[model samples]
Target chain A: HWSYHGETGPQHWGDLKNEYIMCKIGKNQSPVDISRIVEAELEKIKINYSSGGSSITNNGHTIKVSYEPGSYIIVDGIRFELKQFHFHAPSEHTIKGKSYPFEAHFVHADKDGNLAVIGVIFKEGKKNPIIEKIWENLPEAGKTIKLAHKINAYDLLPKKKKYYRYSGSLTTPPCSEGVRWIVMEEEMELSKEQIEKFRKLMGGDTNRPVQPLNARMIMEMD
Target chain B: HWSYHGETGPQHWGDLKNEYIMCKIGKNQSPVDISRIVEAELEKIKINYSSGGSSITNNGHTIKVSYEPGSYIIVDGIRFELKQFHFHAPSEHTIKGKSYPFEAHFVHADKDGNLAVIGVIFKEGKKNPIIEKIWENLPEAGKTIKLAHKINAYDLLPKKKKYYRYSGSLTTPPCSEGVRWIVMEEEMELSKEQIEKFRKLMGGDTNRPVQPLNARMIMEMD
Candidate 1:
């Protein structure tokens, strides 16, 4: 088992098991610094999110909200079904080295098992209604709670669709590479008090430190 | 070029230049948590180093000692020539989440530009004679000083040859991947005063934050 403390923390994750070797050696890992971006005329990711929530669970590492089938995102003509989304405090990725209050990662997977993650950064400013709803129904650790109210995943995203695109891997254990990364350039606002409430429920921060780019190009589009 | 502070610090390194993108996105980056190690019967790394006076330079990042040709190390039968070595305060790689007072990195590379870095962790204890010699001849920023006294690189190594091996990237800007890292398991001792002396010479902390291991296997050997 891996964790964020003592011998089981991030440094020991790669050494924990043979299956988690990628957490220590893979080249294209996620949660990298979002600087050195090259502006490009890119296609807007077609997000087909519906107004419905299946369940929310606290997986020890983070608070995750799973989605129902049918919702998907189109990237390069391929449709990746929305699996679930998770939160990280203090952000996993940074802009020119500046970190925000929190971040949200929407995990999607295609039929081929190929993964695409859409990252949205969060800043402290105004209260976000969408996040507030999820926090209100926060689930206990290892327990799944079905939401009574329907909520659109689209409500979690920023209106501006501009983003930085690159190839990366999962930020958690097994940190498998070859996933497509799309980080929203426009930040969404959250009240500081709201962030603190989520932090308290989650116990502490779950964000991984920013990684290196390693010969990869980061393309930016608005 | 690049520095450890302001807009040029590690946080903005990827944005500084295309070549430095790896400093931000590299997955197998160095200075990771060295835990969850697997003990295995491994071959001893062949060391054929010698005593010689090398030129030391402060490149505004850390104090580095450039070696003369002929010094090399053989690992897995591949010979990597000693290129240079440098220092980091508060250590970089943590062992089971425990950090030492300082660390030394001996950089080596083959003709193909493949690198192998030997990391020696230093705890606060007795004063290190070899570090004292290098410290006595510490060079000024942007300046190189030729040492009058010959020093053996082996003098910095612990008598026990046990170590942990893994694949990782460079710790500094342009954090290129494909580096073979060998971190000594047994830490050597250095006086707290000696560490403070190096810190004073270098100005502030120079170690990079511990990075995620991604999916890498760590092999331990004696």
Candidate 2:
């Protein structure tokens, strides 16, 4: 049973299965419970996704692909190809104890089965060029559209490389183990119109409820 | 090239093709962006999600599935199989023009492939029973587990049935057209604890941002 809302929502995500301990209950969680972390000698977060002339479909659950060599994220010197990215309304990560309107998780993984997620928080203010560009290039429904231009992941990062590092599982089911979460401490600014543009392209409220802090420590890159 | 956010998050979502208008931009889009509705037929909104079995996985993205087949929904006097359900956070519909903390969608379809979605709005409150039960009976990751019990999806609906009706496309990619959208005017009350429980399971924050409201009309059903 695929429910698009609560209980059956994403929070109860673990309830769907045990492999997804991160879904039901985990000591460490991402997007939330962030604390001031110590800076680490890490590489840049690389997003290497290509508009691989593949097809797309709205399965009513999540946007699915046929077989396109997607994107990736670079962290700790490993390149994790971007698995997928989705939106959460009103933002999930609380910045310095404050919540924003929305947040985006660009999930990635390396060949060894390690995960690295980049959290991008959206605030109401100036229009975001990245968001506008994405909205402007959003593909039509039920079809695979290629990007007219090549975009880099570096452009998606915040002005500051400061981030909150922690160990967590996949936010979704199987909830996996050993996921390296990198939540940017810096907040990104997006204009109301930019927000609206994404809001329109994104559909309705698509976030999983904020997970509970069972006993986790969020570390920031000071 | 890869993107940190927007249409390129989920690699399984095929290529960035815009076959449907909803995939690109269209307010009143699916997934999130809820509006409080009025005058709903509460009885018509009840659901019974079968508990035969369910499963969870990353599926290139986070995905959970139940095989019990006990879920079903009725629309326009016609009952359809509640194939599966999923969620969007902060809700997709607006009540008088306000967004909720979360929104759930139960997808239904006839043998011929006609689709209808029943949306539920989640507000901040106490723990929810439906969510608690799911957490209690959660399956293992990557494993398809069935339940010995029969679950009721109807019991989870809000007390009010006043709803908004419209012809729309699927919320996810492929953003299929020809699907009917039925959003409840009233809301179901789940306690704060309940909301937190589900959130913990999902590892929190699994929503897509709101879509654009192009020329779509949100109709109220008396």
Candidate 3:
């Protein structure tokens, strides 16, 4: 029952449970300040996002958007099924010390329990039509809502496919490492009003301050 | 006599001097998260920038670009002469809890020492020609570099002129209050290489984290 505030906040997360020891001691953590990038011959992430109805939920921490299954992304020749996607205001990962207005972490897992999270950072500008549909049926805390129409996860991404790849951990409690984080380079746009609606629904900011890189190297991919 | 690291960082800025007490006790501070904004008829900031030769300096805290006295911005019919401009990696202010890659603060002052800072944020995207020129003549700490050619401050602005207005304190200590802040709603663009260059020159990140709003209202201008 770790939250982002009070004694149960991020700073004290490691003491909350015995299984959460990694929250404090893990060296390779997620949401690290992405600096010292090395250009390499990297593989492009192949995303196969199908259009389907989604289930939205407010898990007290953030608004989670669950796909109807079949959506997946291939990384380094491995297929990871899209489980769910959630948001963090003001982005968790700092690209060369710069954070965005919001960031969506699309969680995917392979049959072997390997996780690959695609991080898409957003900025404030024109209105986003897809997000508009998602916000229309946004669920309240502990509540769930089913979408009337389907959405393509591909539409949520920027046209430029360049990304930063690294080995990191989950940004939440338990803070497990070995997860492959693929953070998009280009930013997508959302309107100010649209972002405000999401913020009000979530209650407060949910972004975790960036963790240390622990001497990990970030590779830039096309 | 204060730096942005260790014991002398922003958290301890208030203890540096009695005059800096406002850094911790001030109700309305600058570099606040620009959330909970209300749409209203806000005044347009009329910028009068001219092409002229300027000098650049890395003042240990930030990379400052000093301008001649002719440039100024008109807000609410009051003209604040542009004294200088500086860079902050990973913008100090947060628009709806989101931070940008870089922010340029065009510091201005009226006849009475009243200040009005225009904050223009930048995102990672297309290459910015004007910033490239400024980066070419970047100065290291304790050193100053004079530009060989004249530059126009107007070239730094985004095409969209909308902004957010509020009353807050200086981001740096002594964290003076009563300063007028106008943050541009439209973010400009800079390439990743350009940002990397600036970061290398500054040695490290120069951004201050967003402070609390403390009952301040942010007005959105169309």
Q: Top lDDT: which candidate number?
A: 1
RMSD of 3: 17.4
- Could you tell me which 10 consecutive residues in candidate 1 chain A have the lowest summed lDDT? A213-222
Off by more than 4 A, model 3? B1-222
Higher-TM-score candidate of 1 and 2:
1
- Over 4 Å off, model 1: A1-222
Sort all candidates by lDDT, best to worst: 1, 3, 2
What would the TM-score be for candidate 3 when compared with the true structure?
0.50
User: By how many angstroms RMSD does model 1 differ from the true structure?
Assistant: 19.0
Winner by lDDT between candidate 3 and candidate 1: 1
1 or 3: which has the higher TM-score? Answer: 1
Best candidate per DockQ, number? 1
Q: What tier of docking accuracy does candidate 3 attain?
A: incorrect
Per-residue lDDT of A37 in model 2: 27
Better of 1 and 3 by DockQ: 1
Tell me the TM-score of candidate 1's A chain: 0.96
lDDT of 2 by residue, A1-222 (tens): 424376666756667765454454343444454543223333445555564323333434433333244566566556777765555666766765677887767667678656677787877887676556555545555444445454444565677866665555555455553566777867777788766655565566555555543223344433
Tens digits of per-residue lDDT for model 3 on B138-201?
A: 7767899989787787888778889887767689998876677888888998988888877777
Error of 3 at A156 (Å): 0.5
- Cα lDDT of model 3 by residue, A150-186, tens digit: 7777888899989887767789987876588888999
iRMSD (1 decimal) for each model: 15.0, 22.1, 20.2
